[PDB]
Amino acid sequence: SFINYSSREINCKIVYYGPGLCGKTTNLQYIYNKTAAETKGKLISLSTETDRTLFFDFLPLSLGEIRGFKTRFHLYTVPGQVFYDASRKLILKGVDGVVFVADSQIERMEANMESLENLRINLAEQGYDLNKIPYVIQYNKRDLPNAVTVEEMRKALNHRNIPEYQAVAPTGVGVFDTLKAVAKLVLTELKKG
Ligand SMILES: Nc1nc2c(ncn2[C@@H]2O[C@H](COP(=O)(O)OP(=O)(O)O)[C@@H](O)[C@H]2O)c(=O)[nH]1
């Protein structure tokens, strides 16, 4: 997190992680579209011929102050192509909370398992433990007929039983529950050491 003493703001970064086409862009799009226009900044997409990154920040107009400071949240997706790992590392630097978006399709489970490990390693490179930091997992695409049961997705992707949420991101099911969960964990950490 970054404390700005001029604007009296605690800036926090939340990174949506996961394999290609799992639903990160959709999560951030739905969050942005439902956020009050006076509290959010510009939604910015950085695209190439093969990949993209989406990010924006907002000031939750609910949400009390912490020692006089208001909290600003910056949401980032991560690129999905194998050759942008450096970018992913750069986006994870200084992360405060992480959401892992899992594609519940059986044909993507292996992909999920890869991305998860890629998250772990990357955090471990910067000195942090995925099990110790604010972190929730989202089982997305529950509407699809090839969606894996929650118990098997948990056996594969959430063996230490961190908070998990089921979602159909295009319609908005589970999106704001996930966001609220990871934001609550981040704020609890902010009110401590
Ligand atoms: N049926 C279904 N489709 C989804 C869901 N979430 C995302 N999609 C679709 O999956 C495709 C990839 O989603 P996107 O957010 O762009 O993936 P990203 O690479 O992780 O950002 C898009 O065409 C979405 O419409 C879901 O929960 N259910």
Author numbering: 2 to 194
From the paper:
A hallmark of all motile M. xanthus cells is the accumulation of MglA-GTP at the leading pole where it activates motility, while MglA-GDP is found diffusely in the cytosol. This localization pattern arises due to the GAP activity of MglB, which is located at the lagging pole where it inactivates MglA-GTP and depletes it from this pole. The ability of MglA to hydrolyze GTP is essential for motility regulation. To gain insight into the structural landscape of M. xanthus MglA, we determined the crystal structures of MglA in different nucleotide states, which uncovered that MglA can adopt three conformations: inactive MglA-GDP, active MglA-GTPγS, whose structure had not been determined before, and an unusual conformation combining inactive and active features.
Remarkably, we trapped MglA in a mixed state in which switch 1 is in the inactive conformation and switch 2 is in the active conformation, an inactive/active combination never observed in a small GTPase before. The nucleotide-binding site contains GDP and a ligand tentatively ascribed to inorganic phosphate (Pi) with two partially occupied positions, possibly arising from spontaneous hydrolysis of GTPγS over time. There is no Mg2+ in this structure, as its binding site is occluded by the retracted switch 1. Structures of small GTPases with bound GDP-Pi have shown that this state retains the conformation of the GTP-bound precursors. Accordingly, overlay with MglA-GTPγS shows that GTP can readily be accommodated in the mixed MglA conformation, suggesting that MglA can adopt two distinct GTP-bound states. The observation that the mixed MglA conformation observed in the crystal contains GDP and Pi raises the possibility that the MglB-refractory MglA species is a post-hydrolysis intermediate resulting from spontaneous hydrolysis of GTP into GDP-Pi. However, analysis of the nucleotide content of MglB-resistant MglA samples showed that the major bound nucleotide was GTP. Several lines of evidence suggest that the MglA-GTP* species identified biochemically and in vivo corresponds to the mixed inactive/active conformation seen in the crystal: (1) considering that all known crystal structures of small GTPases bound to GDP-Pi retain the conformation of their GTP-bound precursor, and that the mixed structure, although it contains GDP-Pi, can readily accommodate GTP, it is likely that the mixed structure derives from a GTP-bound MglA species with the same mixed conformation. (2) The retracted conformation of switch 1 in the mixed form does not allow it to establish the interactions seen in the MglA/MglB complex, which can readily explain its resistance to MglB-stimulated GTP hydrolysis. Further work is needed to prove that the feedback loop operates in vivo, but the observation that an MglA-YFP population remains immobilized at the cell pole when the diffusible MglB3M mutant is expressed strongly suggests that the MglA-GDP/MglA-GTP*/MglA-GTP cycle is required for functional MglA oscillations.
